[PDB]
From a paper:
The spliceosomal assembly, activation, catalysis and disassembly cycle is driven and controlled by eight highly conserved superfamily 2 RNA-dependent NTPases/RNA helicases and a single G protein, Snu114 (7,8). Snu114 bears striking resemblance to the prokaryotic/eukaryotic ribosomal translocases EF-G/eEF2, exhibiting the same five-domain arrangement preceded by a Snu114-specific, ca. 125 residue, acidic N-terminal region. A prime candidate for such functions is the Prp8 protein, which forms a salt-stable complex with Snu114 (15), extensively interacts with Snu114 G and G’ domains in structures of spliceosomal complexes and is generally considered a master regulator of the spliceosome. Still, this activity could be reliably quantified and we unequivocally showed that it is completely abrogated in the presence of Prp8SBR. The latter observation formally establishes Prp8 as a GTPase-inhibiting protein, and thus to the best of our knowledge as the first GTPase-regulatory factor, of Snu114.
Based on these observations, we prepared a recombinant Snu11472-1008–Prp8SBR complex by co-production of Snu11472-1008 and Prp8SBR in insect cells, and determined its crystal structure at 3.1 Å resolution. Crystals contained two independent copies of the Snu11472-1008–Prp8SBR complex, which were virtually identical (root-mean-square deviation [rmsd] of 0.66 Å for 997 pairs of Cα atoms). Snu11472-1008 contains five EF-G/eEF2-like domains, i.e. G, G’, II, III, IV and V, with the G’ domain inserted into the G domain, and domain V intervening between the IVa and IVb sub-domains. It adopts a compact conformation, in which the N-terminal G and G’ domains form a globular head that is cradled in an array of domains II, III and V, and in which the split domain IV forms a pedestal at the bottom. Prp8SBR exhibits an extended, loosely twisted conformation that lacks a globular fold, suggesting that the fragment would be intrinsically disordered in isolation. Residues 402–410 stretches along the open side of the nucleotide-binding pocket and the following residues 411–471 form a long loop, previously referred to as the Prp8 lasso, which encircles a protruding region of the G’ domain. In the crystal structure of the isolated Snu11472-1008–Prp8SBR complex, the electron density clearly indicated that both Snu114 molecules in an asymmetric unit were bound to GTP and a metal ion, most likely Mg2+, although no nucleotide had been added during purification or crystallization. Similar to the situation in structures of spliceosomal complexes, H218 in the isolated Snu11472-1008–Prp8SBR complex is rotated away from the GTP γ-phosphate, hydrogen bonding with the hydroxyl group of Prp8SBR Y403. W402 of Prp8SBR lies on top of the Snu11472-1008 switch I region, helping to anchor the neighboring Prp8SBR Y403 in front of the nucleotide-binding pocket.
Residue numbers in the entry:
A (entry chain B): 367 to 415, 420 to 434, 450 to 533
B (entry chain A): 106 to 519, 532 to 689, 705 to 976, 986 to 1004
């Protein structure tokens, strides 16, 4: 057997490393599920103050007639003036919601529909989206100091 | 006969038409889709696969509505559970540009994870043009930075698709003006790495996309759909070129600076972005009655009645797919941005040797990769000459022997030993393989009969004439971008079933090209991969498929490199004397980059001995070598040089010439297996001081003694110095939200020898991008630490394509090193611990005593 005289010990293999890399980290049992590796770091801004706006949380972006066309030429949707309808913010928040609340059989989103949804996952802080944004920072910044 | 072909989905176009394209070599384009992890390339091929096929069996679930992607190219069970491309897949499709000319274009979908870099290296070796898919949010990160450089490094054309545009509108909720600024900064960074070539939307170089919502477009495509029929046919070309940059439009005019009293919106945001932003906004937020009219009035888009019932996200992917239609702007960018004349001749020279085109009768092909489909082994092969007929017995030569066979070919200018029969020829379809009778020049296909005469890659050809056989060239073995540094040793649980493990290990050596698997002469078998994911994936394949046995493996380990940190003493039948000193720091890097010198005054390492005049010039001018040493260089090997520092009136240079080849061969054996723990030597400058020339013997036996003695001679030179142990260093690319940087730093301190280097703010996003390096031995579970510590708001990947070797802390000859038996060794003992433990696996501390006679060893101890 590979004795203690052969093995190089440098870091302890935490229990979470076995649910992440089963076959590599000596999980052994054949009947262990190989899991979803990860998902791209999501940055969904539900800025909460009306048009779209640059959120102050975001880093800045570095920077900032010889030929003519008909005078009536216009972009594709210049006829419609407003980029943002009154219920766009709610529809976008509803778009990022989970399986139950994100679906409508084609009907228009209403400010009441998101209000009940927002109250719902606020009352269940175990899943969904209440941990996201500032809540996660408060939880994660403290929970690391408490563990170590 | 149809056989099992009855199940493959039919293509809207007749496949026989597509096959007819291959008759004209100028009508085939080999495109490989590459990019960082989870950028969109697997979901991008979905579009093309869907647009090319009439109906997909076993579908009709949430994929039809777009709730979950149809991972058509990621079919392996491990690929489905993990959610990422693992092995290179592809699809041969007939595509048409905006000028109605059609091509057969061979797509290869490469994995984005850093661990599978060996796969994209196969794609780069196969592709003529590469589609680099990048996530808008992360932008031009290190992984795409090295992909740009690596594409330019090879000879592949490039067009950029900048994916996940939905993130800006919905996730970041950026306004169109600020959104365009982000898109411009991304393109800005692209050009900083593309050297002379300028990439821009108006040059059909850059494609926009949101593969999740089913659309990829280009400015040319956009104007062709909804603006071309509103302006004079002559003005269309001038109009597109004004849709990017500081160009503003008002009531029919174009001026560089903004109009004083109108909204100061450039053309791109006014004619493209704000249309996009408000077909996003209106689809999610506007009444279906008013919306259906706008789509009909502005886009000539009719909304079916069932569509008005769709859930929002399926509705969004539906309307967008109605507008942007079959990615044709993408295929235009590919066909326009190629120009084969310059590249193909250059690409073939780099993948092999420079020379004259092969005779049109002789068959010549690049078998790139071994992959198993339906259990049986296949071979990804791209044809360069001749015509591949089914059943044509063909001669296969493993790319390892290519170096030996090419010089032996030139020797024969001053019968082939391996051959076999090709049984089947197939095209890639992602989820299927389409059987084909013949492969034409420029096709990349699947081959079945040839996978038993090579391990990792080979060179296919047919003899044809006797005199054409003096002309052909052999493909150089591929340059997998990263070196294998993750070391795992394993043994079967029951020793009787070890042959079953041996046969399965051979299959992984074929299936995983990045892996390096060897058995040490002492006993157990080692697996060399690049990262945790690479190892965990091959083990499952080894455990749950190819062997199906209980296996026992070790903790994560590494391959070390041993070198010196001082010049050493001279020191010394016959005997020879060499001294070793550390190589120049700048020179070590350059050789790690396979180039010697800098500033357009450099020589590629492959022909470094072949060009003696420039070698001497560059060595003296660029590195500062004195006159005599520059000419006297003999060999280069894995970051080490063997120079000739003997005096001409001690051994005649005539006598030294005949023995010089054996002296090199001994220098080679020493660098392969160093003294302390038999690890490869790195970054050492071996000066050959003097040798003995005893006469009165036969040269053939004398030549046999110099090699082993020169091997042993090099060992004392490194041991007489200050011999050190060098360990590889993983580099780490962390993308993490900005206020979450503290947990990154603390986790970084807990890992030894791990520090943060450059820290770049990602523009327009809250997340920061931090580049760092971590020792490979201390890298175990670091990615999994960071993800859970950050709840997913942090993420990192570890690569080793730069070849960083640091000194393992502490002295390594120090016998009195406290090494705990149950807890990790203290810092000052790491060198001694690592070398002794590595030695125990190899067998049998390390000292100079064994190599020097006891009397001479005593005389040196007193002096
Ligand atoms: N917002 C958005 N998300 C996308 C888009 N395309 C893909 N995704 C998401 O990102 C994940 C990546 O999908 P893939 O196409 O398999 O990415 P990939 O580059 O092939 O993955 P690797 O090859 O392992 O790097 C998917 O599961 C989607 O959920 C896109 O266009 N927009
Ligand atoms: Mg994938």
């Amino acid at each position: 057997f590979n004795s203690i005289d052969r093995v190089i010990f440098r870091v302890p293999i935490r229990s979470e490393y076995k649910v992440a890399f089963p076959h590599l980290y000596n999980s052994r049992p054949r009947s262990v599920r190989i899991p979803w590796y990860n998902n791209p770091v999501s940055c969904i801004i539900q800025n909460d103050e009306p048009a779209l706006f640059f959120d102050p949380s975001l880093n800045p972006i570095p920077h900032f007639g010889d030929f003519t066309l008909p005078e009536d030429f216009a972009p594709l949707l210049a006829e419609e003036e407003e980029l943002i309808l009154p219920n766009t913010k709610d529809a976008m928040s509803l778009y990022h919601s989970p399986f139950p609340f994100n679906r409508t059989k084609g009907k228009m989103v209403r400010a009441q529909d998101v209000a009940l949804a927002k109250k719902w996952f606020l009352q269940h802080p175990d899943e969904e989206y209440p941990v996201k944004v500032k809540v996660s920072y408060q939880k994660l910044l403290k929970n690391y100091v408490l563990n170590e | 006969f149809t056989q099992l072909k009855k199940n493959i989905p039919k293509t809207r176009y007749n496949r026989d038409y597509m096959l007819s394209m291959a008759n004209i070599p100028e009508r085939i384009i080999n495109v490989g889709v590459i990019g960082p992890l989870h950028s969109g390339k697997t979901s991008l091929m979905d579009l093309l696969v869907i647009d090319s096929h009439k109906r997909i069996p076993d579908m009709s679930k949430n994929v039809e509505l777009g709730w979950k992607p149809l991972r058509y190219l990621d079919n392996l069970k491990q690929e489905i559970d993990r959610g990422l491309s693992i092995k290179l897949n592809g699809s041969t499709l007939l595509c048409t540009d905006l000028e109605s000319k059609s091509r057969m274009i061979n797509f290869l979908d490469a994995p984005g994870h850093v661990n599978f870099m060996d796969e994209t290296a196969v794609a780069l070796a196969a592709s003529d043009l590469v589609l680099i898919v990048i996530d808008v949010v992360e932008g031009v990160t290190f992984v795409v930075e090295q992909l740009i450089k690596q594409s330019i490094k090879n000879n592949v054309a490039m067009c950029f698709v900048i994916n996940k545009l939905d993130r800006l509108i919905l996730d970041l909720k950026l306004p169109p003006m600020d959104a365009y600024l982000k898109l411009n900064h991304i393109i800005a960074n692209i050009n900083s790495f593309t050297k002379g070539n300028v990439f821009s939307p108006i040059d059909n170089n850059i494609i926009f996309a949101s593969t999740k919502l089913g659309f990829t477009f280009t400015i040319k495509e956009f104007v062709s759909y909804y603006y071309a029929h509103s302006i004079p046919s002559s003005k269309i070309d001038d109009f597109t070129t004004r849709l990017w940059g500081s160009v503003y439009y008002h009531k029919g005019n174009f001026r560089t600076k903004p109009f004083e009293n109108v909204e100061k919106y450039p053309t791109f945001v006014e004619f493209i972005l704000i249309p996009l932003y408000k077909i996003f906004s209106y689809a999610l937020s506007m009444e279906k009655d008013k919306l259906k009219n706008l789509l009909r009035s502005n886009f000539r888009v009719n909304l079916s009645q069932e569509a008005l019932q769709y859930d929002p996200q399926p509705f969004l992917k539906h309307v967008l797919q109605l507008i942007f239609r079959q990615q044709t702007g993408l295929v235009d960018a590919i066909t326009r941005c190629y120009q084969p004349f310059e590249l193909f001749d250059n690409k073939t020279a780099h993948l092999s040797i420079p020379g004259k085109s092969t005779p049109e009768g002789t068959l010549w092909a690049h078998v790139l990769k071994t992959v198993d489909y339906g259990g049986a082994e296949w071979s990804l092969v791209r044809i360069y000459s001749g015509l591949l007929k089914r059943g044509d017995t063909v001669r296969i030569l493993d790319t390892s022997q290519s170096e030996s066979r090419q010089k032996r070919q030139l020797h024969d200018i001053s019968d082939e030993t391996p051959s076999c029969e090709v049984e089947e020829i197939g095209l890639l379809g992602g989820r299927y393989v389409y059987p084909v009778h013949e492969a034409h020049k420029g096709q990349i296909v699947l081959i079945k009969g040839i996978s038993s005469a090579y391990i990792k890659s080979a060179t296919l050809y047919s003899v044809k004439s006797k005199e054409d056989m003096k002309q052909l060239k052999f493909f150089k073995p591929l340059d997998y971008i990263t070196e294998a540094v993750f070391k795992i040793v394993l043994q079967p649980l029951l020793p009787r079933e070890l042959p079953k493990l041996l046969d399965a290990l051979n299959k992984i050596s074929k299936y995983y090209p990045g892996v390096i698997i060897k058995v040490e002469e002492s006993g157990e078998h080692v697996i060399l991969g690049n990262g945790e994911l690479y190892m965990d994936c091959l083990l499952y394949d080894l455990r749950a498929s190819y062997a199906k046995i209980e296996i026992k493996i070790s903790d994560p380990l590494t391959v070390f490199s041993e070198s010196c940190s001082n010049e050493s003493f001279a020191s010394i039948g016959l005997s020879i004397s060499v001294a070793a000193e550390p190589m120049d720091s700048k020179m070590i890097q350059d050789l790690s980059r396979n180039t010697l010198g800098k500033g357009q005054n450099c020589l590629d390492i492959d022909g470094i001995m072949d060009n003696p005049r420039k070698l001497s010039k560059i060595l003296r001018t660029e590195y500062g070598w004195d006159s005599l040493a520059s000419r006297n260089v003999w060999s280069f090997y894995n970051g080490n040089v063997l120079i000739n520092d003997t005096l001409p009136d001690e051994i005649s240079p005539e006598l030294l010439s005949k023995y010089k080849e054996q002296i090199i061969q001994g220098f080679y054996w020493a660098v392969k297996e160093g003294p302390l723990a038999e690890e490869p030597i790195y970054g050492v400058q071996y000066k050959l001081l003097s040798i003995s020339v005893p006469s009165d013997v036969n040269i053939d036996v004398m030549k046999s003694q110099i090699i082993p003695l020169m091997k042993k001679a090099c060992y004392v030179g490194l041991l007489t110095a200050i011999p050190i142990l060098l360990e590889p260093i993983y580099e780490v690319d962390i993308t993490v939200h900005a206020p979450l940087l503290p947990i990154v730093e603390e986790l970084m301190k807990k890992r030894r020898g791990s520090r943060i280097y450059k820290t770049i703010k990602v523009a327009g996003t809250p997340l920061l991008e931090v580049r760092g390096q971590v020792p490979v031995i201390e890298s175990a579970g670091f990615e999994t630490d960071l993800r859970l510590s950050t709840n997913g708001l942090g993420m990192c990947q570890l690569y080793f394509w730069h070849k960083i070797w640091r000194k393992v802390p502490g002295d390594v000859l120090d016998k009195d090193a406290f090494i705990p038996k149950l807890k990790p060794a203290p810092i000052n003992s790491l060198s001694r611990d690592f070398v002794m433990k590595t030695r125990r696996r190899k067998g049998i501390g390390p000292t100079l005593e064994k190599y020097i006679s006891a009397e001479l060893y005593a005389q040196l101890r007193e002096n």
